[PDB]
Design a protein around this nucleic acid. Structure first.
Lengths: 316, 316
DNA sequence: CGATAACCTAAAATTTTATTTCAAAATTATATGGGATT
DNA sequence: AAATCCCATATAATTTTGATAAAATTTTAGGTTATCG
């Protein structure tokens, strides 16, 4: 592995136990190297300046900051493997990316209650999207990621105790089609309770289910949420639906919805509400399914001296 | 850097920008290496099996779990330096200490409200330790570490706004005597409000100050808390004082106080109270001085499904 | 008169804290084309 | 009839997510002194 492409090729073959989406992503970076001048350099000649100039090119190509930072970390790990193989001494990607580029990531603004009520009223009223009203309510009332919602089946709901049992996701990719991913341990499994509006939503979704094709994958069947074609919804299908729905909303409402009103924005709103209401962080972390509690805590506003003093006075 | 001792000696010389307590700690580990068989081995002959046996000896010697794990981290860093200088291949200290030793660290259980009210009652009434009643109230009402308390001077209190300005600590060591450690960035400096009890206790500390000798160090003078000898209290002095206070308490009380009832215990109790009361986690992280929000979240009890459900029901 | 409480402190130990991604794996945007509704 | 949604999906992109010890605190041992047994 003397060329950078060959080195990355060696890295991903050595670390092959990955998911289908990971194989796609690696392919995307491999194409970047093949097109970029950096992929041709021998690894023993790649200097810290070459890696930085690579980033400037990626930004000039039009790739976002988060993309360029993620790919930098892939390359960094690749060169750390060539270091442990006695090919080079220093790792030319061991620099801070913010020193070279500015992070212009557009913040993801959650929905405000006023907007949320407005957004839902439009959905239930609209004759084309009202059929998705139930899914949106469930998203907003549970924090489910989109492929966890798609993976729900009759065996995952418990209406006696009003609990959602989140144990897997249903995914779909080109070629392979549908498949099920689930956690290796029992930590990714969580149980989310249903409030009155979520409980009533699942009831409507089960009563109105119609036209299900014969479908079973990795032992899972009888999914709650189906496309018109009789097969279950996928993340992409909801993404596309949200885009058209938001576009239709902004045409008739003066105040448009945030630019990034996607399915995850429902999870973001759900988490922001609970945090600002002062939910026990460890409890919120359970509902959300976060592994590191740092993830959950990013949803709590930074504290100030006056912030803290108020809290201490509030607690005698 | 052929023997392990010579290697460690190189790791500390190359990384010399350390505080006095670090120099003491490294010296302690150096003694262990010089007394242990492992100190004599050539680094190119230290196998993973060898490092594990070192830990067994340390535990056989009587060193606690955390000590051995801390020292293991030191040795590991030293071998990463040798691996980066092309002296060895793999790091023989890259293993989980859990697999060799069990962690018998006795948990530090904080004071229950009933204990605290009893502990303070005894101090106020005791003819010998009543003079320290004020320092202990402040410890319990502010969460100050012990060397931050010893560092408090008139210029650090603000009785108008009733705020403590923590910006430094006062330390003392054999030979060097006293010195002041401040944070590099203004992130370690924080401000703590005074409750009635605490503000009332600072007034007593200043009215009763007596017998101060001329003393200024790194620009700091007029310290609130002083030994009988006219110089300020140090961490050690409060430690020994706490040790005798607890002994005298456990003689006249049936239910003894926790084994680890030290000055830091007061910081522990303070933090546990606010966490259990449901204080904003990031507001508590500010008051405490924790640099990472993970350190503060350790004081919150893990959540259960029932714990989480009751919280979501509470936030209708 | 002795034992030991109370302070002080050198020496020796334990405990509290410190920067944290050596990319995977998901989600979303978009171009296209064939129906359905303007 | 021209134009615009609505769905579905391949393709391409963005976003979410999962200790490489220093520096403090505390314990203890030995001595003096003051207090108590």
């Amino acid at each position: 592995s003397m060329t950078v492409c060959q080195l990355y090729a060696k890295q991903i073959r050595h670390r092959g136990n990955v998911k289908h989406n990971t194989k796609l992503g690696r392919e995307r970076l491999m194409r970047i190297l093949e097109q970029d001048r950096l992929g041709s350099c021998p690894i023993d000649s790649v200097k810290l300046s070459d890696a930085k100039e690579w980033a400037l090119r990626m930004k000039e190509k039009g790739l976002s900051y988060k993309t360029i930072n993620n790919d930098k970390r892939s390359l960094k790990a690749a060169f750390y493997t060539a270091i442990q193989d006695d090919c080079i001494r220093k790792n030319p990607f061991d620099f801070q990316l913010s020193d070279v580029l500015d992070d212009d990531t557009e913040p993801k603004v959650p929905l405000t209650p006023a907007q949320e009520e407005s957004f839902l009223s439009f959905i239930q009223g609209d004759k084309v999207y009202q059929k998705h009203y139930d899914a949106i309510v469930i998203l907003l009332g549970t924090g489910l990621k989109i492929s966890e919602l798609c993976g729900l089946t009759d065996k995952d709901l418990d209406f006696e105790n009003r609990v959602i049992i989140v144990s897997h996701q249903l995914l779909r990719n080109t070629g392979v089609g549908y498949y099920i991913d689930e956690p290796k341990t029992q930590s990714g499994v969580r149980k989310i309770p249903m409030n009155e509006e979520v409980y009533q939503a699942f009831q409507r979704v089960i009563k109105n289910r119609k036209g299900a094709k014969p479908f079973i994958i990795d032992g899972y069947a009888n999914f709650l949420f189906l496309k018109q074609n009789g097969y279950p919804m996928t993340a992409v299908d909801y993404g596309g639906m949200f885009g058209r729905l938001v576009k239709k909303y902004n045409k008739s409402h003066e105040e448009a919805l945030p630019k990034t009103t996607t399915p995850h924005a429902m999870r973001h709103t759900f988490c922001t509400r609970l945090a600002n209401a002062g939910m026990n962080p460890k409890a919120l972390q359970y509902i959300m399914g976060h592994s590191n509690i740092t993830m959950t805590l990013n949803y709590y506003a930074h504290a100030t001296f006056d912030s803290a003093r108020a809290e201490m006075e509030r607690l005698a």
